[PDB]
Subunit: 335 residues, 6 copies
């Protein structure tokens, strides 16, 4: 492989399909999407925008935290497990957080939770999600050792904020998180930022990453899945939005960020890499949405399994390789 | 049956399919939806949101008033008839009202009409619909004995108002109608109210029923079909709206209102009972709409057939029972 | 006088100043405006848009219901009295309504109230105002014999409505009220309607009066003071709104309506008769507001004394005659 | 035929399918739509709203200019060629314009271009499109002899303008062009205009054609394909927009314009002639759009083949005849 | 003087006051503003944004075209005359236009007109203003020889457009006009353009001049008075808008455009030269507006008298010199 | 004094004027407002919303940071000095920040700054303001020892945020700062929050304080001057906004927060304590604004001198006492 994975893991059992002969694109979709349908739970209206990591357990080789909206259209998080990373066993009830410290008992009342991202750091799995604080969106933080008990920490930021995604390790001795300042409604703007923390409680040294640039990403952008560490820097899949007369179209692509200062962009692909085109992407609760929240990387082969939400209804998968994405990113670089 | 139907009628011939074994919902769809396609009339752009009652005719056992939108996209009411309540013979031409009284000859000019509701009271069938008075939406009122001639009455209210639905008997000596104060466009709000009339002309004693509450019904709500009288009080299906970044999603559910003072809520289901999920509910003139304007009830068995507009394009059917709805309403109740 | 006053009163004591020689306008202002300053009460933020009638009491020859906004910016009604019609003794505290019938003890909770209109009809003074019902604007209704105790009746209408104004007698056996269908915010529209009632409780036979026409009244219109009965028909001052890039401009003018069917317009003045031009009309809590809620008419001479809110801050007076207004409306008429 | 085609061309090779026996419409759809899928090019996100004329070359009997949106969602024009008018060989790469005079070398920088219209005038093919001038939409103007080299002229008008369409000959000594004053975003208004030029550089004598009228066209209208010259006058297919709560629905119909003063409407069909109803018209990048930019007319038979955009995603075809349309337009005329 | 006036006139009688010793600004105000009060006509609501030129007649040495809004708030143009350029004799009645050619008898029906600009070219005075075409704003054109009879020509452009200002001579043998593409309401955007015409009927070769830039001019800009020809190029006073939470603030400044191609900016002052600060500029029908439509320039001294609208209520005057303004524009230039 | 000032300062030379005999208010205005006019500096468009503390220097007994908007309408901070606290010597030029550490030389480029607040903490003066990071509002942080050199630190938070106000000592060993999550425009919402920091660099443990409540503060609220420590807890003046049809009205009041957990509201005055009512408050750049950013407190007497911006135009002074404010706040408390 021309581009090496750093601090990756060996995933010979990575969900995978080969790139169809007629497929002329960098990324190709799994041939039996969606892998998690809207009604997989008795109480679920939709299941989408969901986080997955390799994790060995009684129920399989992968685990995850899943955005589940019930028939009240309440937004919740459910833990889930899988042997092959495709057919998922999702807890019927929501994660009920325990507080890591007693000092956050008052403040962390449950309201809602959506769009989680999950990664392992040094000794545990960290969950971020869009958490309600007094019914306002900010970034929630929790950790878990076993995806059974979840320990909630302080919300990282003030509202209004969304798309909080942790880098998978400390950089220069500091935890680093993508976020994306927003508002109280259907946010019509959006630049990506990073913020830094020595202890995962106090955040600062905020740095602007990038903002809306090309047409497909002209209205707003946001961080997708956990950054992938690479010979070239941080490989970051991200979402971008185009505004039509009828609403929003959510596509995603990728950029490469400087290894030591992730807010500096080395390359940024000028094209989307996947956009709403199939029936399950264009038809649902929210039309024309493809929203990546997790990837699996096999460091041995550089194969990538991408999980993305479709039309805010279901979860689908797609495949590509680190070499293929990096190559295309660099060969079609914006600015 | 645990809950009794009060002042109901015997309908052994009610359109009916049994609940499938795989089905985990309170309400299940007719397996051959839609029952009325958009192009059933030579001039129809769409047929939806329509009123249906038992009525013994030369042309069948059921009659109705149908919202028909033509290829001007004008909005009109058409009388229809059916033997089985599933296959309909809809008049090719619109209802042309006659004024019940001379005193409305000048006032009631025909501009538009949509979303009729119809029920029998005492000696005749009463029709309500969203009626244009100087191209502003209010509640039109009319009656008929035969679904051949329609006698138009005074508009019940000042604009701007929509979703006028009559209770099917007097209550404490007065006619009672649901309505839903609106504005001059795509109304971004809406609470259910009742008004009271001794004579079907003068209205007053306005009482607030309820407003938006759960996420699925957070933008606005409004009355659906004619209220059903039960031992628990009034069973009322109603629509609720969720606003996404791309627009509105119309779902519907049910509440139970006090027998004597129906603006007082006894139970209200926190969950929708049906939401736009099939292709014909999600794709059409207005995506993501399931909109109930009529139900049939067989008082002998408690079976309910529900007619509902789909994507403002066609008319579909769903089934449930009074007991199933009531049990679920009571056990999943909001406030 | 050329135009006669019908069913008026002898008011030789009417507040008055003669038309200055250098005046060219149909309506001239009192020379020591405002007559009621924003801070006349210890708790008042502003006092404006207020109602006045001849009433003989110990505290004088005139009575009224005044809109008072307090230093919370709450909207309240205070009763008031005056010997000359110019200097006002206003109650320091809000009218606390008593329910006329027990049937409204539940429904009529006090939320807020503004823009009263008042007239004597056959045996008492009737009061209308914009009344909160569940914090939504509609028309409140009350009566009083002595301006000391106020008896609240049913709200005449559903929200959202404002500018409810009674005609000062029954017409064809029915009470008649101006109103103006509105919305839940700073309403960007507005036509005048009348509604009719046999008993001041149930309302129906709604009729359209008129809508925005000329530029000065192009955004919205609304009834002002009590209709004045005349040889020409009903003389009605109404406000109209023009929208600039910075907000609204409230002026007012007059129309003449058919005696028998007051929704039919006989004459309507193309120009405003007064608009915001003085410092106390242009600067204040809401700039450029000129808003009449009462007139006194001396039937013996045709003298009219106009009370009008200025900049939503204070109350001011202006003067004109019935013949002048009538001549000018008829000779400068729209449609 | 009852109506004759004036100044037309003999097109016995026109793409054509007969009206189905079950078709009850003026216009019927090709039965294998779309004819150009979104991904016909390796770089194409979507191909729609496209211009076609008869033109003899080595690659076929018809040529075109096609709107292609690439995977950055940039808007470009690509020339294309076809043997039958149904299977199309479109250039992989955009038209790179040459300037006709040196005088426009400075101002005509390429930004974007979409919705081209093309017609033959005396000695060459003219192209109009929506051209960026400083990223504001206006009407770009060019000509070609071979569809291989394109020569750009002066932008016809100031921004903001869209839907510029040329009449296929001079009228009263002058070139005549449809356009449609717009704004800087998703224009929520739109009337059709004509402007006149002696030389295709300077435009003047601007004339209003018509504005939104019927419901299906209530929000805005614009010109579609090249006007067809006829014994009854100019036959002009046009698009019209209705606004639902979820956005815009684009439909199209026809009108007939006076032969010598084409701003004067003679007839105007009250109904749409085609509206978004099939799955490739309702689902896509932009839901519910059918947008006609080109027709082919066989003057011998009166057969018409219509090229129209679907869902801003793909290109489709429909068929009708000059007589069928003209008769329907004249028998179902608005005003 | 350092900067010379080109093609100017000797104006020893120019209205003038010397700069106060305490004045630290480039432009100082006349000390008895307004020079034209809102009520100078018996019918006028407001008189503002008005055009003025030197012109010898029986009524004085200056003549002009004045925007008068009457008590309907209709917008009209009135002719006016002055002996001293300060006290004005304004015709009580509107200019009623005569068509230059009979070919515009039909189109040029009068709707409204405002914001006139006037300059002498070769042999007559040319008048532009914002003219209604079918109640939409565009630029009207007309000429006069004596300011008594006015000859209307073709509207120069399509709607929507405002701020049409002619250069006072041909340039490269073409008429040159500033305009400012707008929209149907209170336009929230605006760049300056020029267009070119060989005959004042057909217009083309459109060139972008400049856009909003500095904070005080961030929302939109527009041309002011007739360009003044100097040895630095064209001295062009222009208006620019800032948006606060309460509305717009209109200030004005100056730029210097290239002699040969006036769409190329040589200098552009970063600061405003005058902004709303006085009571008559800040209080009125539209608060915070200072709007220049005319200047007199005495070529032998470089004195400049500026006429400008204040709060869309009245006309005021200010003074400066060509040298003062050119030095300041250059030494405080933007880009 | 019933209430004590904790950790206060002896200020016998506090600017002061005794309450007028006819003053029926908690707070009374200085009788020669403004104390700083819009044009005190040669460059200044307006000077308002400014920060003031006691500080012994060569230029006086008080110092501060002043918001100066220049004649580009750029927003700046200027240091200033005063002998009496009423007559100010303000630097003609902006504060150019030094970076406290080189780690912020890249990130902290100057764009704009406004609404400064200043207080002493342990060994230096800390400055917060609304600081542009990539032209997005957030809270800037700096310190000074002498008001001559200012050392900039890291922005406390992500955009979008404003009204950052530091408590004047550590609480529980942490710095505590008011802020107010906003958006990218004229923010139509706003709640007060605090955030906590060990080191003035990293922030967390965010706590909701309060949001809009009473009509005068129905739209949004925000922290005003530095919190004052008191026997009753933290005395905090804050601004509140009401929205009319014409824009915003900015008033201000006071609340009392828990000494140890300042996000917990003990008392909250239901009424405003000062609103826009004088000509310098109601008329100017932004109408109807009274915005407090600094108080002086004499701990010996309880005298409070209040600095506040008026109409975004000038600075005024008001007067009150701790006991007067605390008593009124306690006896007129909201929730």
């Amino acid at each position: 492989m021309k581009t090496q994975i750093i601090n990756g893991v060996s995933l010979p059992n990575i969900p995978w399909q080969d790139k169809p002969a007629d497929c002329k694109d960098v990324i190709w979709r799994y041939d039996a999407n969606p892998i998690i349908p809207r009604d997989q739970l008795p109480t679920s209206n939709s299941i989408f925008n969901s986080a997955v990591v390799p994790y060995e357990s009684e129920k399989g080789k992968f685990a995850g935290v899943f955005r589940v909206d019930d028939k009240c259209r309440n937004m919740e998080l459910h833990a889930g497990f899988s042997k092959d990373g495709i057919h998922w066993d999702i807890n019927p009830d929501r994660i009920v957080f325990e507080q890591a410290e007693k000092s956050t008992e008052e403040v962390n009342q449950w309201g809602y939770g959506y769009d989680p991202r999950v990664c392992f750091i040094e000794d545990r799995f960290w969950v971020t999600w869009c958490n309600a604080y007094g019914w306002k969106p900010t970034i929630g933080v929790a950790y878990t050792f076993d995806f059974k008990t979840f320990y909630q920490c302080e919300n990282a930021f003030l509202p209004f904020n969304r798309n909080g995604v942790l880098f998978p390790r400390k950089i220069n001795g500091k935890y680093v998180m993508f976020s994306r300042p927003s508002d109280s409604g259907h946010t019509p703007f959006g630049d990506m930022f990073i913020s830094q923390s020595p202890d995962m409680k106090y955040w600062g040294e905020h740095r602007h990453v990038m903002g809306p640039l090309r047409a497909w990403e002209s209205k707003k952008i946001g961080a997708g899945p956990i950054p992938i560490e690479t010979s070239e820097g941080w490989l970051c899949f991200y979402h971008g939005v185009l505004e039509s007369c009828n609403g929003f179209v959510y596509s995603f692509s990728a950029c490469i960020l400087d290894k030591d200062e992730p807010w500096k962009v080395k390359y940024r692909c000028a094209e989307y890499l996947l956009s709403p085109q199939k029936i399950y992407e264009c038809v649902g609760d929210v039309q024309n949405v493809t929203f990546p929240c997790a990837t699996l990387v096999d460091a041995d082969t550089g194969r990538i399994a991408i999980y993305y939400g479709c039309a805010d209804t279901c979860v689908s998968m797609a495949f590509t390789t680190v070499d293929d994405v990096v190559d295309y990113v660099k060969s079609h670089s914006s600015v």
